[PDB]
Design a protein around this nucleic acid. Sequence first.
RNA 1: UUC
RNA 2: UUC
Lengths: 775, 774
Amino acid sequence: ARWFPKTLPCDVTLDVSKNHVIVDCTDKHLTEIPGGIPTNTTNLTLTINHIPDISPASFHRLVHLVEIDFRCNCVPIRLGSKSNMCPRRLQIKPRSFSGLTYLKSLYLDGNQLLEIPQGLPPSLQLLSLEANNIFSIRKEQLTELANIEILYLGQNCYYRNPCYVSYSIEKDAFLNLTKLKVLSLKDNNVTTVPTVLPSTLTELYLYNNMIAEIQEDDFNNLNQLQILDLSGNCPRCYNAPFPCTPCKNNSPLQIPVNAFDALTELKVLRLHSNSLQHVPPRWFKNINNLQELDLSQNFLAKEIGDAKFLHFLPNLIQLDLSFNFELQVYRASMNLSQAFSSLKSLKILRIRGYVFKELKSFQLSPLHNLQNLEVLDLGTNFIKIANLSMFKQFKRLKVIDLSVNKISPVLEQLYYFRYDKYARSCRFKSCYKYGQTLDLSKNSIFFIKSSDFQHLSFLKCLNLSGNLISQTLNGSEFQPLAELRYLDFSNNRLDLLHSTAFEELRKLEVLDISSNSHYFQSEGITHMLNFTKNLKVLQKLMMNDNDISSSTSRTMESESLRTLEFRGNHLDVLWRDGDNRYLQLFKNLLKLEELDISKNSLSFLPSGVFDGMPPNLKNLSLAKNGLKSFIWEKLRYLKNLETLDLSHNQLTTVPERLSNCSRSLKNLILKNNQIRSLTKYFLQDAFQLRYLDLSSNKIQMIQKTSFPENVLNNLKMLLLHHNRFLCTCDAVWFVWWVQHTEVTIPYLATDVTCVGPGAHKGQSVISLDLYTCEL
Amino acid sequence: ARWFPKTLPCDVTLDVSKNHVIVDCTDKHLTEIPGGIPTNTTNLTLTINHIPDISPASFHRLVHLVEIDFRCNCVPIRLGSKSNMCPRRLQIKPRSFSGLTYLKSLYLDGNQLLEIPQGLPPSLQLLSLEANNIFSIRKEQLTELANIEILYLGQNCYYRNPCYVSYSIEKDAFLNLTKLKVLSLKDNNVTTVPTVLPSTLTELYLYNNMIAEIQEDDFNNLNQLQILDLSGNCPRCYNAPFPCTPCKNNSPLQIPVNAFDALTELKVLRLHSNSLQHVPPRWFKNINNLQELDLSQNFLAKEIGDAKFLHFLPNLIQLDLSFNFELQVYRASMNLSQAFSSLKSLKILRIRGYVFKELKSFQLSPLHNLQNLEVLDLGTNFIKIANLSMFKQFKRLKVIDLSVNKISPVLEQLYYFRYDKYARSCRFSCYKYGQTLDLSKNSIFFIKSSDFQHLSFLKCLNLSGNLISQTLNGSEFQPLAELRYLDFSNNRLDLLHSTAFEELRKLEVLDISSNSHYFQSEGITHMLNFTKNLKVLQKLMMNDNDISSSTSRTMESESLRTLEFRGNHLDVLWRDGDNRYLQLFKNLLKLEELDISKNSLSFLPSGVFDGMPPNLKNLSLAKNGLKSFIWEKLRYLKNLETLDLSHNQLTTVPERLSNCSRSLKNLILKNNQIRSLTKYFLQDAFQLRYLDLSSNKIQMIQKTSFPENVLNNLKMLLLHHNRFLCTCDAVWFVWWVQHTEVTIPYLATDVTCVGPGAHKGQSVISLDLYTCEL
RNA sequence: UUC
RNA sequence: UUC
Ligand SMILES: *[C@@H]1O[C@H](CO)[C@@H](O[C@@H]2O[C@H](CO)[C@@H](O)[C@H](O)[C@H]2NC(C)=O)[C@H](O)[C@H]1NC(C)=O
Ligand SMILES: *[C@@H]1O[C@H](CO)[C@@H](O[C@@H]2O[C@H](CO)[C@@H](O)[C@H](O)[C@H]2NC(C)=O)[C@H](O)[C@H]1NC(C)=O
Ligand SMILES: *[C@@H]1O[C@H](CO)[C@@H](O[C@@H]2O[C@H](CO)[C@@H](O)[C@H](O)[C@H]2NC(C)=O)[C@H](O)[C@H]1NC(C)=O
Ligand SMILES: CCCCc1nc2c(N)nc3ccccc3c2n1Cc1ccc(CN)cc1
Ligand SMILES: CCCCc1nc2c(N)nc3ccccc3c2n1Cc1ccc(CN)cc1
Ligand SMILES: *[C@@H]1O[C@H](CO)[C@@H](O)[C@H](O)[C@H]1NC(C)=O
Ligand SMILES: *[C@@H]1O[C@H](CO)[C@@H](O)[C@H](O)[C@H]1NC(C)=O
Ligand SMILES: *[C@@H]1O[C@H](CO)[C@@H](O)[C@H](O)[C@H]1NC(C)=O
Ligand SMILES: *[C@@H]1O[C@H](CO)[C@@H](O)[C@H](O)[C@H]1NC(C)=O
Ligand SMILES: *[C@@H]1O[C@H](CO)[C@@H](O)[C@H](O)[C@H]1NC(C)=O
Ligand SMILES: *[C@@H]1O[C@H](CO)[C@@H](O)[C@H](O)[C@H]1NC(C)=O
Ligand SMILES: *[C@@H]1O[C@H](CO)[C@@H](O)[C@H](O)[C@H]1NC(C)=O
Ligand SMILES: *[C@@H]1O[C@H](CO)[C@@H](O)[C@H](O)[C@H]1NC(C)=O
Ligand SMILES: *[C@@H]1O[C@H](CO)[C@@H](O)[C@H](O)[C@H]1NC(C)=O
Ligand SMILES: *[C@@H]1O[C@H](CO)[C@@H](O)[C@H](O)[C@H]1NC(C)=O
Ligand SMILES: *[C@@H]1O[C@H](CO)[C@@H](O)[C@H](O)[C@H]1NC(C)=O
């Protein structure tokens, strides 16, 4: 079907709308640019390789390049792999880019460059030099960048990539880049704001440096600036998980009261970790457009109770005041200034790490008439006492976040305490949807009762994950939560003694009781798995990692359940050969379409398991079970089966004729098994098959009988990588078909490889030439 | 060094005292008895193989056999592997055993046999036929067993191996085996006690059957019986995790009040799961040597407050009344009859599953003057309230077990609820420190010193698996002046204060593993230097805490010998460029054992080895994804004797091991990616005694890399599951492996050629390379 | 691969 | 393999 096989080890894409020819050679263990890159290539990506040099020959034919991404071919040693350290910095020979008349974007980050590469074409609009060893900027090295708009110079001098001197920038080095819009000088050991900067700037990143003071005229001309980030100058170093040097005498970053006067267009001001003790209202006199203000990791605990500057911020959308607590102080309560009531546009307020014992309703009164408020984040505050009914006055909010507290009767796990949360990787560049969410996860709730939720009938999602709840629920504990659609009860100690647990949550659609194994681990204890009968709109049930090996009831029942996750239990014990009592455990989940019973130690499946499945089962995972054998003909009982996941098991064979085992199967996942050959007529007449994963097995040969064209050409994807292909003359059909098929097969360039014979070991089958088999 | 390579795929051992030649072929994937078994073989084990038959040829030369263990060569289908189902039962041809004149133990369990094999030698003293399909015993099939002493016939008819009929035993079938001492008919669908049994019986196992009634004389003549087990006849089926049929009409096993009168020697009586509602005192009138009584899993809740029968048991050592609760009843308290006070000899009392809300000191008063009591087990009772000070009156006890309760302000995990806890396999803790209070798996969310009032005698406290989410400051355990062992694992310890635990001045072992909760949230203070104050601490476990940050940069202890730090994030703590924690363990000056496996250490920054404490002997870096290793930095570890690098991604060994460590005895490199050894790898590494290179990708090993003067000192050399290429280049290695004195495991099964073509799959021990010497 |  |  193909006349010319693609042997280039890069992915090639065509989006002819934008007439882009996209060549992506990311992470291909290349030591030179591969031959035969399309002449029409516009976007060429070579990041994460070991190409030691660039020369005029590098891009000789590729005159239409608009973007070269040549990052991370010589990463600085602390930043890069310690098993493949770059021995010598990337060599860029003269004239390598001057011929590239249409080049708009050049990324050379992570190559141990010592200077700004010269000879760049005047079409260039974006240059990226992060994670190099360039720490002196001279105006003469920037003359070539007359038309530049975006300049990334950061991460060239910091603790992971030291230069052992202060960063140097010549006076007015950037002034004559009259088109410059984005300047990033982060993580660079800079000591002063470089001046004078071009007045076209819209974004200026100076964070994680050694700037001790702002001059009153440092930002005088920047009347188009929208984003300014000065964070991490005079850092707050307490509990920093990176080497951190504070400004002497506990001093803050010193910012004159009029330093921001020119910045009428400013939308984002980031002053995180500047050891600030006050926020002068005068800072904001001429900024009436500010939408985002980050004041986290300062020393503003007192200021939060005063906060006159908030009166100047009526258009503010997002305010972050997290981690401003005074060292060694555990306050009694949270003192929020009345000034917070003037934040009329506020959507998001975060005050983690204020550290106080008791939250009381009146303490939130400055927020009552903030009509656009959507997120209130009070996590990581060691709160011990909180009457949850106070949120009856916050039904308009989307998320109330009290996660990680000590209450008892979406941001990443590392966020406020990382060095540079915006840093680029070498490779690239949740229940809120249900409605109002109260996040009580990771607290100390050991016992719950209905009155705890009084006046909270509006809640749609309650997150109780990771509390200490070791209690037999009987249907009385959540009675006010008449509207709840999603309950996360994971990581507790639920005792399913009563089949009436949760039945007061009459609108519940999703229940997560995963990782409640405690009471399932002790022998002889009653467990009622049939508690689902009473939940009349329950769509999804998660009970993963409960170690369930016994059940008092023999059947689960539901007229609504569509999805059951039952991973990490002991169905091998429940289904011990000779014990027929639980072979219909799921049969009466009449609407069940998706069943995950992976990781259940099922080394075999007893007869009756498939007959006992509910009638509309479509998607079954038996992954990671150590399955050693499988009666494929039993799939005939699953008349609606469309996806079968058997990955990560110990199967050695496929059925003689897949089509004779299931008339419905679309998606078959067999990756990571022990299969060494396919049956002679494996896929014969499997007209419904659309997706087949045979990767990471031990297959040596595949003949055409096993893989008929009329089936192969309906496949959306066929995965064959990481097998044991034997590239002898017996393999001529397979090698030819793989080279010439239009079926999608990933990793042809990297992991569809001959293991023999001797000559061809390690060779890609796509590059294989077998003419000697045709003499 | 050997002149004749051992090619037999069995382990051969000599005990020349008892002049036993022990040949063990367990689980060697044999389809025939191998040729060349020593003619002097006395013990031959063939269990877990696929030998389809036995014939006179089988043991024809092996005239000196005293024991044949030929179990599980055709396991019943439900009991065996479903990936290798035996297609047809073991065939035993006539005359196969009659020549074995010295044969005394024959194990034929697990072979789907249909009858008792005949032609057995008159020497036989033990015959084992478990897990077969023999469910009718006729006296004529047993005449051959005149001298037999031990007869195992169980597991021939039960739910995992059904026969679909009642078991049949002919009248007096066993009577004329006048030497029979042990009879096991368990798990067999038996309906009546077989009579008459020979009076030589010392042990009789009738449990898990369908016996509804004992007759008055079922045990009339058995005055030599020491163990009787009738458990599981009329079972209590509530929450049974196996198919369980109770006797009809809620009946118990019906035992006449005089049924045990003849049993003057009886020491062990097991009546577990017999649905008993009463225990008649008259049962025990003529047995007062009884030492062990199991009454668990009956309906004896009422009886426990009465229990007049206890007055007849003054020699009882061990009593079990667990799981006697009435269905759907949550009692307020435990009513123990005064009769318990007469159990003068009692060492072990177990009453799990009584199910009551509150334990009060008065309820235990009948036990106050039992001077030999050692174990009180009240686990799995759903107790909510218990003043722990009440155990001030039980300081003589070894273990007080309140585990798995709901308290708030060694037996296996499956024991009382398994079908047959004594069943055979085909193939085959802090009590030591003193008084132990086991509070594990309760609901304790907060602790205070007064909780431990009057418990200063405690040597080991187990708080594992409670709900303790608390910053300890050194005040919480003040009364426990003698505690040597604290298990605080699986809680939510908050190490805010470096004074945590410092009141436990005698503490030698601290387990704070699986307390990750407060370590998983960013920005929180943690004081890892809390070890300073514990001046006799020898062992500290802080596994699986996800530790990735620390406010203190050094831990110090002047006593700690063992630190377990597995399952943390030293990769984050030692992030390249951050030098602050590279001495975290340096000031544990007496540290000898350090486990930092499972720490995501894909590399070790320079300075980690310099930062190790000076006396480190045993270091685990296993399961780290380590991709590179500067072997020369081991020079800093001047006392290193064990280095565990298993389950990593290393590709090379050092060029000269001897230049890396002058002391290293034990190098574990299993489960890595090593594809060849360096040219002079072990040259002059005279101190090495143990090298595990198994599960790597090694193709060839030459004598340059493996000098004989080093290899022959090894206590063990592990090489299995590699990538061996058996060409003429391999002549030295193959010859050395065949003739070596050094122990190499799995030679018979997994030291194998992968090529070339001819030899693929062939064991190197059997390899013949004469064509290389033509 | 007798639990 | 810039976090
Ligand atoms: C940032 O610049 C400072 C100097 O401004 C560097 O500090 C010097 O480092 C060298 C070698 O480490 C020392 O000998 C000097 O005494 C230091 N000077 C001062 C004033 O401290 C620092 O190393 C630079 N940071 C990085 C990450 O390169
Ligand atoms: C080798 O076989 C003999 C014969 O069965 C085993 O000896 C028995 O050992 C037990 C251990 O207490 C004694 O009670 C029996 O009376 C012995 N039987 C005799 C002496 O005939 C011996 O244990 C076996 N050894 C091995 C290693 O398999
Ligand atoms: C134990 O014996 C009983 C009979 O005493 C067996 O039960 C019979 O089983 C057959 C086939 O399943 C039925 O047709 C009979 O009706 C049953 N009889 C009775 C009285 O129930 C039982 O199968 C045997 N148990 C085992 C494990 O084999
Ligand atoms: C964002 C807070 C980081 C520092 C910290 N760490 C902890 C911790 N591990 N546990 C606590 C438990 C209760 C109260 C405060 C803290 C605490 N705190 C706050 C704290 C407040 C007060 C004190 C008393 N000096 C010590 C610590
Ligand atoms: C060994 C006990 C097996 C049965 C059982 N299972 C549980 C369980 N999962 N949680 C409980 C929680 C509190 C009290 C009793 C039980 C209980 N119980 C005891 C029990 C259950 C039910 C009742 C009647 N409400 C009384 C007592
Ligand atoms: C291709 O390069 C252009 C110019 O730098 C850029 O705008 C576009 O996003 C790139 N597209 C892809 C798919 O890389
Ligand atoms: C809150 O703090 C501010 C400034 O510290 C103070 O003026 C005010 O009185 C405080 N209010 C309360 C209720 O503590
Ligand atoms: C919590 O506040 C609610 C709402 O005003 C009130 O009804 C209730 O009494 C309070 N409960 C507690 C325990 O303070
Ligand atoms: C509940 O909170 C836990 C703990 O932070 C989190 O992992 C989980 O995703 C949350 N659940 C939902 C449904 O958002
Ligand atoms: C459920 O339990 C609660 C708390 O123990 C109790 O108040 C209520 O009476 C119980 N309800 C039923 C129907 O058992
Ligand atoms: C669950 O099963 C038990 C029997 O084990 C029964 O008592 C109970 O009524 C059942 N509950 C529901 C809701 O079906
Ligand atoms: C099948 O279910 C799995 C979850 O186990 C899901 O990830 C996958 O996308 C589903 N596939 C289809 C085709 O529905
Ligand atoms: C399998 O194939 C045979 C022969 O073609 C046919 O009789 C049988 O009905 C088939 N079974 C299924 C489920 O397709
Ligand atoms: C403490 O109890 C746990 C849980 O039952 C047990 O696993 C652990 O071994 C015990 N600790 C000691 C030191 O015995
Ligand atoms: C430790 O904390 C407990 C409980 O909070 C308190 O009673 C005690 O005074 C504290 N001890 C010290 C030495 O601070
Ligand atoms: C542990 O270190 C902290 C500071 O990091 C110090 O305040 C504390 O006293 C130290 N404690 C011990 C026992 O060394």
